[PDB]
Write a protein that binds this DNA or RNA. Structure first.
Lengths: 93, 50, 228
RNA sequence: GGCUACGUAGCUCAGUUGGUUAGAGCACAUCACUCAUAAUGAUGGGGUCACAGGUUCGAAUCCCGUCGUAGCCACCA
RNA sequence: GUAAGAGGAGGUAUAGGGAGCGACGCUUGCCCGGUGCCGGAAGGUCAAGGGGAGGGGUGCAAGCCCCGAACCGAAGCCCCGG
RNA sequence: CCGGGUGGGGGGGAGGCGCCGGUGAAAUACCACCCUGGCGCGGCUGGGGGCCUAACCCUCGGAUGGGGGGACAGCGCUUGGC
RNA sequence: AGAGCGCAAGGGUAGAAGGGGGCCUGACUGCGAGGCCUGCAAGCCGAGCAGGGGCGAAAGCCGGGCCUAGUGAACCGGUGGU
């Protein structure tokens, strides 16, 4: 998908795993020449933290979870009341 | 064929070359033939490498 | 009791985690000899050349720029003419080809042998079951095959050493003689380090210079920073 | 190429870190036993421990050089 | 179906999917050598990884960067039987 | 290796050992390192099992929670195979 | 000259290329006039020069083998050097 934090959306085709077989040197090359093409896309996960007056979830990046708890910190500072899950969660950032 | 194989001869007194062959099967231990290098006149020549 | 009383004190002077180097070894290990007489500095040297590798057990032929003081007497089997040479050197009853049975027919009193290359052949085939296997006969690098091996008779009467590898490189460098103080100990040990580095294999990876253990003969020895 | 294991009697198979004194069942051999074949017991022929090298005073028992056998990865302008 | 989820099935080994034959009556012999398939906590080979003995460039040096053995790193094929 | 070696506790006591000779490849108090195999630990470094819940996942008449599973399962990146 | 001259045949050869001995190592370097051959490419032949070298009393031969088959442009890189 796309993280709710710092973007982090997929990558395709010439993203890569290629295959290749690749060149180097271990004779006339490791296996000399070698060549091909593939596919590759990011990370995402879940952080369903409480905070304030209710409960809320998160689609967090690979290593952007401390940032979530930071948003929690900034969150506490203001007036977060009423019943409005993602509505509050958005007023966050 | 590799039995007669292919080796080369370098001088002593630092490097030098000349192109040759062998014959390991035949009573051929090592060789110290007598040729000429790029530098100076005729001298030693020692057997080595592939 | 187990290692003796002398060695319990001489234990309370090792602290088996030390170095000394050729210096502090020369001095303090000059002290480490309180036992009898002429303890042979036994530099005990161990490295790593896989207790044969076909032809890598050193041989090192050294005199240690001073002297030992013992005796080898050489004997020699030096085909008449070569006897002459040995006759101004230190070779007891040089016997051209006859003192062979005063080695073979049970009559020892000798070391080295020097002999010749001539008789080497001949005299090799006879005593290569005693002096050979044990450590006297020719070994064409132990100072025992030649007439320039008589110059080597004087070499063996100034110090031979036969550095070999057995099972641990091992070798016991012999001088020290508990009557050499600082000077001769310093110079002797450093000299042995020199000959050591001189006789080297052709690609035997590892620590060419671990064990040194510079034991006089009756006590402590812990290393010499296996270098200086 | 790199790494690994094995190759010893005509057959098939152990003795494997020594140091002894190289085997087993088949099979060949002249017997033995049975009245009779076979069953089995005995004594001999066959090793030239994959060939050499080196370690050891003393290896088929160990390192090393060549090949034959196979196994996977893996090289081939 | 990239996926959410869907049918399976609000069904549960007399239930659901896949294959060979094709009522019923008689019957279904030998081969695990090649292969597929079932299992098997010894092992060969092999990955990134982990590791660091050991080598080099360079600075006066502190240092920085690269090369990298021993030896521990799976699946798998080999091996073993069915 | 059935032969003795190694160690401790003690009695008791002024007495007990090593070279050559002898034998074989070697000489056997003591000293130096090392090998064989082991044993205990210290550095590195993995293999295997249990329990816990709180990540993650299932479910139960709203559940702030109870019950189940749980560091696997799901997934993201990379690693070799088929 | 029907023998021999490695190997198939053909040419040729005892005024040697065949067969015996001694010293050796010119399967030499830097070059190459001018010719064979031929679509290109490649292949074939070689006097002499010059370094220095082997043998030879000298004259002199020597850029492997009596000659025709025993061979693979380029792109990739391995290895020693400059």
């Amino acid at each position: 998908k796309v993280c709710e934090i710092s973007g982090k959306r997929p990558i395709v085709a010439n993203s890569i795993q290629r295959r290749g077989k690749a060149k180097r040197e271990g004779g006339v090359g490791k296996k000399t020449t070698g060549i091909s093409k593939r596919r590759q896309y990011p990370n995402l996960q879940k952080v369903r933290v409480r905070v304030a007056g209710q409960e809320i979830t998160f689609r967090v990046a690979a290593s952007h979870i401390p940032k979530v708890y930071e948003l929690v910190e900034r969150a506490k500072g203001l007036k977060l009341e009423g019943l409005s899950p993602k509505e509050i969660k958005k007023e966050l950032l | 064929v590799r039995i007669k194989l292919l080796l080369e001869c370098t001088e002593c007194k630092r490097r030098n070359y000349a192109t040759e062959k062998n014959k390991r099967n035949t009573p051929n231990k090592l060789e110290l033939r007598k040729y000429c290098p790029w530098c100076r006149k005729h001298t030693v020549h020692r057997e080595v490498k592939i | 009791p187990k290692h003796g009383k002398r060695y319990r004190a001489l234990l309370e002077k090792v602290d088996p985690n030390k170095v000394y180097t050729i210096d502090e070894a020369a001095r303090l290990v000059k002290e480490l000899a309180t036992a009898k007489f002429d303890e042979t500095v036994e530099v005990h040297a161990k490295l790593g050349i896989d207790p044969r590798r076909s032809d890598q057990n050193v041989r090192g032929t050294v005199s240690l720029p001073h002297g030992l003081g013992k005796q080898v007497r050489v004997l020699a089997i030096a085909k008449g003419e070569k006897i002459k040479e040995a006759e101004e050197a230190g070779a007891d009853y040089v016997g051209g080809e006859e003192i062979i049975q005063k080695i073979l027919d049970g009559w020892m009193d000798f070391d080295a042998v020097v002999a010749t290359p001539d008789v080497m052949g001949a005299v090799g085939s006879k005593l290569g079951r005693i002096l050979g296997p044990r450590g006297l006969l020719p070994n064409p690098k132990a100072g025992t095959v030649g007439f320039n091996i008589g110059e080597i008779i004087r070499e063996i009467k100034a110090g031979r050493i036969e550095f070999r590898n057995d099972k641990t490189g091992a070798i016991h460098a012999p001088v020290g003689k508990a009557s050499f103080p600082p000077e001769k100990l310093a110079d002797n040990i450093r000299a042995f380090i020199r000959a050591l580095e001189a006789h080297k294999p052709e690609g035997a990876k590892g620590t060419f210079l671990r064990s040194v253990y510079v034991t006089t003969t009756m006590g402590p020895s812990v290393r010499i920073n296996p270098h200086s």
